[PDB]
Amino acid sequence: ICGDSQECNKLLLQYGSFCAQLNRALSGVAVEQDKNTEAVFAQVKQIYKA
Amino acid sequence: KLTTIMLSFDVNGTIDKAVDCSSDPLSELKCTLKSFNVSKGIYPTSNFR
């Protein structure tokens, strides 16, 4: 939102919880798809050789 | 000097503890996540430094 602006950041300091929601939701989605990629592939633990 | 800080308060209106997120990466994490207790993990941080 703010291009390293002091006044813009000073006004966003009244919307801290909004960006806390956004960062937490996107981090949870990223961790969720790391879990998805782990669950679809990593089912067997012993990596058998060719 | 001009500094961004995070201040907590109790039920009595007294200041419990301060962060001063211009000195430490953990302080910047505390100002970013809007909390004083942070769970274990990796978190992107803002530009308070």
Binding site: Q6, N9, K10, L13, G16 | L2, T3, T4, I5, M6, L7, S8, F9, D10, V11, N12, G13, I15, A18, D20, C31, K34, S35, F36
Partner: peptide
Amino acid sequence: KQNVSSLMRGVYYPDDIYRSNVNVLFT
């Protein structure tokens, strides 16, 4: 005439208004 360290000894009340049970940011 030497230096010491500000070991968290500069925290004051920024605003005159009353707040309780919150964690708020300041500049």
